[PDB]
Amino acid sequence: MDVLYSLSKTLKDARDKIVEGTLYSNVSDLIQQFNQMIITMNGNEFQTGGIGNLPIRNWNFDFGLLGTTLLNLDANYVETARNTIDYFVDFVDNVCMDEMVRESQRNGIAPQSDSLRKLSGIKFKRINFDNSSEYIENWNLQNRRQRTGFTFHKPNIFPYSASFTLNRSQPAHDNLMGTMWLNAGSEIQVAGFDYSCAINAPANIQQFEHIVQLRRVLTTATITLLPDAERFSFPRVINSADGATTWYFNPVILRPNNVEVEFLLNGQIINTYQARFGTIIARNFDTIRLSFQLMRPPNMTPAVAALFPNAQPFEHHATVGLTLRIESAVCESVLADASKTMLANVTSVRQEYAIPVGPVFPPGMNWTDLITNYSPSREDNLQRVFTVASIRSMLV
Amino acid sequence: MDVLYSLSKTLKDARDKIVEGTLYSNVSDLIQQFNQMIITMNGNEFQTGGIGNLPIRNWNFDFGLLGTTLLNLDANYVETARNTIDYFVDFVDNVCMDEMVRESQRNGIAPQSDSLRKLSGIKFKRINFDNSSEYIENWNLQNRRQRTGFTFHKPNIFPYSASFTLNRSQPAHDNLMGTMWLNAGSEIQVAGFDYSCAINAPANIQQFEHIVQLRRVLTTATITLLPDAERFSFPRVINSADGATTWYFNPVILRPNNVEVEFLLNGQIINTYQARFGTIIARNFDTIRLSFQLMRPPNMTPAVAALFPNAQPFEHHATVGLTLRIESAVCESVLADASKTMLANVTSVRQEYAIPVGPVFPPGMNWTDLITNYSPSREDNLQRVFTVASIRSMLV
Amino acid sequence: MDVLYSLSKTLKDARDKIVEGTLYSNVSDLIQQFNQMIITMNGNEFQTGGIGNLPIRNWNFDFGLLGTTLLNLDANYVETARNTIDYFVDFVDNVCMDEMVRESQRNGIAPQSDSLRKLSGIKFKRINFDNSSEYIENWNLQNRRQRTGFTFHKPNIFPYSASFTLNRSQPAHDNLMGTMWLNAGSEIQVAGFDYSCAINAPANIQQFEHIVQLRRVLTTATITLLPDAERFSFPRVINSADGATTWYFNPVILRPNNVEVEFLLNGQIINTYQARFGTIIARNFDTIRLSFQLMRPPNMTPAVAALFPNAQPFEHHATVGLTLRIESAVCESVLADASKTMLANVTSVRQEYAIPVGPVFPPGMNWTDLITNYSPSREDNLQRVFTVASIRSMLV
Amino acid sequence: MDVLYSLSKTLKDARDKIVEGTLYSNVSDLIQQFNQMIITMNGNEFQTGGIGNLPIRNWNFDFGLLGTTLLNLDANYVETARNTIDYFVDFVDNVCMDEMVRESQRNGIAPQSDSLRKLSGIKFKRINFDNSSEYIENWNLQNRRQRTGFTFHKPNIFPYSASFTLNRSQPAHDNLMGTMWLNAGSEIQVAGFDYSCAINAPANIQQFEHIVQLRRVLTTATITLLPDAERFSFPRVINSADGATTWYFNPVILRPNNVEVEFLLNGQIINTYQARFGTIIARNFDTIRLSFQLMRPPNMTPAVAALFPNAQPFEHHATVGLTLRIESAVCESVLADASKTMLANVTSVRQEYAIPVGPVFPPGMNWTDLITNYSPSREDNLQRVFTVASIRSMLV
Ligand SMILES: [Cl-]
Ligand SMILES: [Zn+2]
Ligand SMILES: [Zn+2]
Ligand SMILES: [Zn+2]
Ligand SMILES: [Zn+2]
Ligand SMILES: [Zn+2]
């Protein structure tokens, strides 16, 4: 991996720095690294495999060294370098693709394709140089069993789940009490709905709770918390839990009362926020507990007082919402997020060459199914393919 | 462009690296590059700014070099460098502004201002060194006609469009079947509404379709697909298709049925997702085709049964919705996006100096018009000014 | 491409210049170029492939150089040169055919045949010399991302379409208002027909508008615009839009009123011609808007007044016309035209060897389908095959 | 003109021939010519533009020669040559645009732009070499008082004119005898109509004549003559000669009788074609006389006999026709034609830079007005701008 990364980094530096007219002192170290790469690679045969529709490709390296002895790089130099660089970039791209489409249940962190296994030999260690990218740096940390850290903007930590729980219900679904939620991406929308508007509650207060168990720990997470859930604040016809019938939802939104957001780690309270909206920092947690309340308004103008009668039928159901967005966070594991392209790159490569589903990942690299069952073997394979994808994206 | 980028990169490196106390071996190559820049620019006269209110500015270079044999940089050295750095930064900013406010129909990729045309001379090519930024890398690859793409977080690929289509209509607008959509930025919110709830539709299923043709191909795109459209889920009074009368929309949201997303390229099915929500990957496409269906719930509770009568009047209108957010993608052409400042920078420069409208871009650099009619010439000019804006933002 | 073109150009020069009795000084430079080609090709094995019915052919080059000893070329010299040239022409023609019958969706501009891929290696660059053909010139300019130009006499820019639009219609088809058009090749014939002769029009004016979107931008275009549309000026029996019935058209031709021809680029008005007929120039456009009017004659002689009653039935339907021929134009993309034979050569080669339909071109090389869906991939493949067809037509 | 053309031809040869890998013997003479151009242009300041919206541009020439010795051209050589060529091509394009937008009543053949007047000095005559194009060759032949010739495919020799003459008429416009014609470009459709069908004409024959005077003599003209005129063979509501009223035309086409096409020079008959249709050759003529007779069919069938009564009213009007198309001709003067783009180039350059109407040409370079009043001064200016446009086309 570090050798593949160093090949790609050398090629990217060569493409960016070996340009016409440049001073040789700008590229001296790059020229030495490039020549070391050529020397290490010369004489070696590689085969990038025929998994799926990925074509079988054969690679032979017999290249001359890049010249020294120029004060400024000229067009001849750039042309020779470009020929060599183009061939090397094609090879590295094919190696990255061949690695991206493979997986093993056990030892899934180890290289899978033949070319990357060959490149893991001692003889190629000479190629290795500056491992500065986030993914390669975390790869080296993981190899050394050190703390790993990935920074995500809008981490895709929640699998898609649009569900509801009815805490009070009956076959006619006209006096219902419960909660409905959408967890997706970095966003949670939850809403506690009471059809009776807490007329018969002990203090006219209906408590609502929502626990989301993150499948990986997050740290240094900045989170926007907003009082209402726009997703569950308009009239809906919702299937019954067993699918037999449909019930009706006619929300009228009251401001949530006694909002209590707890960020928990291993069943311990780390962060607590009461009646706080806007940005909050959850420094380290694996669970989010939202406790809100519908407090029946003690005073109601006639227009308001009409909507909440003492008894049934209840036509305007009192709903209190909450929206929680994880804007950015840090996780020790690789995750899909809004800004990066690793998951999309891996999925695209798997789809383009018709890679059959393997024994590690869900078909189509479906992220909901992946992160619902984010097993350690899946974590290793995903970190591997994502590091390879990031190495590829440096050149392609 | 490469020379202007190299000037800006040299100035940025001089600001960052030529600092008090630093080992000369940290800065030797940079000092050499800086001195080569001084030597190349010395004795050359430049004129920037004769357009709009951008004032005429003349630039002369007679600057001394920087030493090459001390061991650690001291405050004297930094003071010697800083005045030259300031003059050069001013010159580069003015060259960038001069280029940003200019356009041409014939060769929009070619330089337009006098100063950048002079900097295209072979003698200035010695200034050229590490072209490592995404925009300059894409510039160099595009000059060679190599495959290269820009990576966008939330690309602004959709021109603003809030419209509706009625498949069933009549002058009173009380039994309407059709679709309403917002296309904005990287977001598509679409909603199919049936006022009769497909009471008389075959199989009680009403099919809605929505096709969005992207002006440029997106690759390796991450998409969030949610099953509701919060934008079309509340009562609305909407103008008629000719603006003669206003009709009423009173949605009640049913979950969309048989949800299908087809990402297509040149009319071919590339990606297909059925009943999939959350994160999906579209590897290569120019068109998004969303097919969804309103299905009457065969079993309704009494409130739900009341909502939808067998015949008119229809007061609660059955609506199904989809929301599609392109979180990240890659495009071979430049685009505005939520992360970068290139479009904003170019617009700000054009507005601050009252640049007359040219023959390439819409007035005021309006993005909706520009992306609606994103022609190859407009793409050329936009890539030029966006690369210049990125070069300018390296120093300003 | 440049190498294959240079080979063909050398062979053509040799065929035209190596003739009995000619001074050696007439051919000295040509002999040097030819011997350089012999030196470069000697020892290289080529295979022209077996796609479709094209025979697999193997090519071995072990030729001696052409002599330099004669003051005037004799018959023996011409015969030896003829033998070598015949083998080389056979090879170049086979390579061109093998390239023309192949296509790619990913990189359709890049060589597809194995021999043209081998000829792209650096070792063959010595062969490369004068690139003076319009197609090779455009190829080299495009490789450098320079403004390309293809000049077309009667460009085939309009896909074949004979259609009509009825703005007013009824099931009996006797009071019809609308337009009928033929768009074919470089010609547009449009005709607006009103059956009531605008008897009840707001000012006795019936407006017709025809919008034709060109698949590519045309420049420096010479266009003949004529008042009448001879194609829609005789009695016709026309299928209904659904093919259920046939209606009757009995045109009587009036002079079009307020003839306004707009040539638009990016929806902006570039050229406007009002009441102008004959030759006009459209400098740069991609859309044509033809707006014309059937104006009821304020005064009529008794026969004319008899043709047009005040109410139904209507026997003589007032038709106005417009004819628009593009005689010459310039396009940045390749196109079929009335003079060049590139499309016909590519189609003939594909049909002669029964090339299976591929993933780029329509399944006959049919031009209407191709120009209708002129995608960037299609344009790339078409430019490649048209350049190869021009290179082939230099020899065959 | 010869010097500007030599500059452009040198630049075009340099672009086409100075390519990577080519033998130096392929370019030696070209390298010498290019170096001579550099020597002659060195130390000279030029100014272009300053008219309309054409920008002022200053050009200073200080370039070195190409003295490098090589067997084959490398990238360094090509890049140096390319820098010089790009500057020179921009200069030549600007000089051509500057000359194309200018006119003078006196000495309109002579150079008008200051740069071209300076280039006419003796010191620049060294640049002059091969003058092989049709337009520059004709320019030189004319300067030598030798007979020049421009070959035209479909010469635009007829100004647009859709007219009619009534030889017998009355206010009712129901018993009309006369002719109607369209003279457009290289096409002439003419039709003689008699409403009485020559019932009372002497010998039952009605004679029609049509004289078209060409503004310039044509030679070696290939003409297609067809019996019928499809443009005047459908029902038509035509305007009155004064425009007061409208008359009705209901053609029934009879074959023209005693067809005689006379091609005349100075009123003498050069070519005569009697009852000959298809391709004919008019070797040298300035006038065309079409004489054709409507001969009443002596023997009719009842359906035919019913169309032609003895007296008014006349419903079916007997029309004979002729179509005359000049496919190719040769003119000593310059003309627009179907295949070339010189007129379109000049018009485009004048429109793009908003050139005010001058004292020689009509507004917008309208070809009908220009060719209707094709005066000697107009002819001189037109040849100048067309030669300049042909020189510009070689590079742009
Ligand atoms: Cl965001
Ligand atoms: Zn239920
Ligand atoms: Zn974001
Ligand atoms: Zn409506
Ligand atoms: Zn119809
Ligand atoms: Zn009259």
Print the SS3 string covering B254-287. ECCEEEEEEEEECCEEEEEEECCCEEEEEEEEEE
Q: How many CA atoms lie within 13 A of C170 on its CB side?
A: 6
Residues C272 and C285 sit within 8 Å (Cβ to Cβ): no
Chain A nearest-CA distance from D75, in A, is 5
Distance in angstroms (rounded) separating the CA atoms of residues C26 and C21: 11
Closest listed residue to residue B212, CA positions, set B161, B255, B151: B161
Closest listed residue to residue D114, CA positions, set D59, D39, D44, D49: D49
Where are the strands (E) in A7-157, listed by range?
45-48, 57-60, 150-153
Distance in angstroms (rounded) separating the CA atoms of residues C31 and C67: 8
If you measure CA to CA, which chain B residue comes closest to A389? B220
List the alpha helices (DSSP H) in chain D: 2-17, 28-41, 75-100, 114-119, 134-143, 302-307, 342-352, 367-372, 376-393
Of A25, A171, A245, the CB nearest to B32: A25
Q: Is D20 on the interface with B (CB under 8 A)?
A: no
- Paired tokens of D40: 């002659």
Residues C384 and C108 sit within 8 Å (Cβ to Cβ): yes
CB atoms within 10 A of CB A275: 11
Rg (CA), chain A: 28
Ligand 6 is a single-atom ion; what residues have CB below 5 A from it?
A: D 240-241
Chain C nearest-CA distance from D78, in A, is 12
If you measure CA to CA, which chain C residue comes closest to D250? C252
Q: Is the dihedral of CA D346, D352, D357, D358 positive or negative?
A: negative
Q: Is D19 on the interface with A (CB under 8 A)?
A: no
Mutate to test the interface with B, among D83, D84, D90, D91 (most CBs of B within 10 A): D83
Phi and psi at A342, nearest 5°, equal -65, -50
- Paired tokens of B369: 């018009």
- A376-393 and A134-143 helices, crossing angle to 10°: 140
Distances (CA, A) of A51 to A94, A101, A386: 12, 8, 19
A78 neighbourhood in chain D, CB within 8 Å: 75
If you measure CA to CA, which chain D residue comes closest to B107? D396
Mutate to test the interface with D, among A18, A74, A80, A83 (most CBs of D within 10 A): A74
CB atoms within 10 A of CB B249: 20
- Burial (Cβ within 10 Å: 0-12, 13-18, ≥19) of residue A175: middle
Residues D342 and D276 sit within 8 Å (Cβ to Cβ): no
Distance in angstroms (rounded) separating the CA atoms of residues D190 and D162: 10
Cα C375 → chain centroid:
15
Q: How many CA atoms lie within 13 A of D267 on its CB side?
A: 0
Residues B226 and B277 sit within 8 Å (Cβ to Cβ): yes
Is A153 assigned a ligand-binding role in the annotation?
Answer: yes
- Paired tokens of D111: 């150079």
B121 neighbourhood in chain D, CB within 8 Å: 83
Is the peptide bond prior to B313 cis by the omega test (within 30 degrees of 0)?
yes
- Burial (Cβ within 10 Å: 0-12, 13-18, ≥19) of residue A298: exposed
Would strands D246-249 and D236-239 be described as parallel, antiparallel, or unpaired?
antiparallel
Of B32, B281, B301, the CB nearest to A248: B301
Q: Tokens 């040299």, residue?
A: B10
Residues D176 and D195 sit within 8 Å (Cβ to Cβ): yes
Chain D nearest-CA distance from C20, in A, is 23
Interface of C with B in 248-267 (CB under 8 A): 265-267
If you measure CA to CA, which chain B residue comes closest to D62? B121
Phi and psi at A6, nearest 5°, equal -70, -40
Of C145, C217, C377, the CB nearest to B109: C145
Flag if D159 and C297 touch (Cβ within 8 Å).
Answer: no
Residues D297 and D159 sit within 8 Å (Cβ to Cβ): no
How far does the centroid of ligand 2 lie from the alpha carbon of residue A247, in Å? Answer: 7
Interface of A with B in 230-249 (CB under 8 A): 230-231, 234-239, 244-248
Chains with 3 or more CB pairs under 8 A to chain D: A, B, C
Flag if D248 and C304 touch (Cβ within 8 Å).
Answer: yes
| Farthest CA pair distance, chain A | 94
Chains with 3 or more CB pairs under 8 A to chain A: B, D
Go through chain D and list every residue after which a break occurs, taking a C to next N gap over 2.5 angstroms, comma-separated.
Answer: none
Is B286 assigned a ligand-binding role in the annotation?
Answer: yes
- Paired tokens of B193: 């509404």
Q: Is B122 on the interface with D (CB under 8 A)?
A: yes
- Burial (Cβ within 10 Å: 0-12, 13-18, ≥19) of residue C69: exposed
Q: For chain C, what's the residue count?
A: 396
Residues C177 and C193 sit within 8 Å (Cβ to Cβ): yes
Of B106, B145, B372, the CB nearest to C147: B106
Closest listed residue to residue A175, CA positions, set A230, A253, A249, A252: A249
Which ligand is nearest the CA of A168, by number? 2
Is C72 assigned a ligand-binding role in the annotation?
Answer: no
- Paired tokens of B75: 């405050």
Q: Is D75 on the interface with A (CB under 8 A)?
A: yes
Q: Is B125 on the interface with A (CB under 8 A)?
A: yes
- Paired tokens of B295: 């299905």
- Paired tokens of D252: 């029934």
Residues A12 and A4 sit within 8 Å (Cβ to Cβ): no
- Burial (Cβ within 10 Å: 0-12, 13-18, ≥19) of residue B114: buried
Phi and psi at C300, nearest 5°, equal -140, 140
Q: How many CA atoms lie within 13 A of D311 on its CB side?
A: 0
How far does the centroid of ligand 2 lie from the alpha carbon of residue B252, in Å? Answer: 18
DSSP H/E element including B346: helix B342-352
Which ligand is nearest the CA of D173, by number? 6
**Would you list which residues of D are annotated within the binding site for Zn(2+)?**
153
Cα D323 → chain centroid:
20
Q: Is A72 on the interface with D (CB under 8 A)?
A: no
Mutate to test the interface with C, among D86, D246, D374 (most CBs of C within 10 A): D246
- Paired tokens of D387: 């030669």
Residues 6+ apart with CB under 8 A from A144: none
Distances (CA, A) of A290 to A196, A224, A231, A281: 22, 13, 17, 15
Residues C27 and C111 sit within 8 Å (Cβ to Cβ): no
DSSP H/E element including B11: helix B2-17
How far does the centroid of ligand 4 lie from the alpha carbon of residue B163, in Å? Answer: 12
- Burial (Cβ within 10 Å: 0-12, 13-18, ≥19) of residue C228: buried
How far does the centroid of ligand 6 lie from the alpha carbon of residue D172, in Å? Answer: 9
Interface of A with B in 282-341 (CB under 8 A): 336, 338-341
Flag if C301 and D246 touch (Cβ within 8 Å).
Answer: yes
- B134-143 and B2-17 helices, crossing angle to 10°: 150
Residue D178 identity: G
C286 neighbourhood in chain B, CB within 8 Å: 375
How far does the centroid of ligand 1 lie from the alpha carbon of residue A338, in Å? Answer: 7
Resolution (A): 2.4
How far does the centroid of ligand 6 lie from the alpha carbon of residue D170, in Å? Answer: 7
Q: Is C107 on the interface with B (CB under 8 A)?
A: yes
Mutate to test the interface with B, among C139, C140, C145, C372 (most CBs of B within 10 A): C145
CB atoms within 10 A of CB A373: 11
B358 neighbourhood in chain C, CB within 8 Å: none
SS3 of residue A217 by DSSP: strand
How far does the centroid of ligand 3 lie from the alpha carbon of residue A153, in Å? Answer: 7
Where are the strands (E) in B40-176, listed by range?
46-48, 57-59, 150-153, 158-168
What does the DSSP assignment read for C246-283? EEEE-EEEE--EEEEEEEEETTEEEEEEES--EEEEEE
Flag if D341 and C307 touch (Cβ within 8 Å).
Answer: no
Where are the strands (E) in D227-256, listed by range?
236-239, 246-249, 251-253
How far does the centroid of ligand 2 lie from the alpha carbon of residue A198, in Å? Answer: 19
Distance in angstroms (rounded) separating the CA atoms of residues B215 and B228: 26
What does the DSSP assignment read for B173-229? -SS-EEEEEEEEETEEEEEEEESSTTSSSGGGEEEEEEEEEEEEEEEEEEEEEES--
Where are the strands (E) in B296-316, listed by range?
none
Residues A11 and A27 sit within 8 Å (Cβ to Cβ): no
Distance in angstroms (rounded) separating the CA atoms of residues A237 and A246: 6
Flag if B376 and C332 touch (Cβ within 8 Å).
Answer: yes
DSSP letter (8 states) at residue C143:
H
D365 neighbourhood in chain C, CB within 8 Å: 281
SS3 of residue A246 by DSSP: strand
Mutate to test the interface with A, among B143, B327, B330, B339 (most CBs of A within 10 A): B327
Residues D228 and D296 sit within 8 Å (Cβ to Cβ): no
Is the peptide bond prior to A376 cis by the omega test (within 30 degrees of 0)?
no
Flag if C145 and B147 touch (Cβ within 8 Å).
Answer: no
Closest listed residue to residue C1, CA positions, set C384, C393, C395: C384
CB atoms within 10 A of CB D147: 10
- SS3 percent helix, strand, coil of chain A, rounded to 5, is 30, 30, 35
Q: Is D76 on the interface with A (CB under 8 A)?
A: yes
Q: Is the dihedral of CA A79, A82, A84, A90 positive or negative?
A: negative
CA angle C262, C268, C272 (to 5 degrees): 25
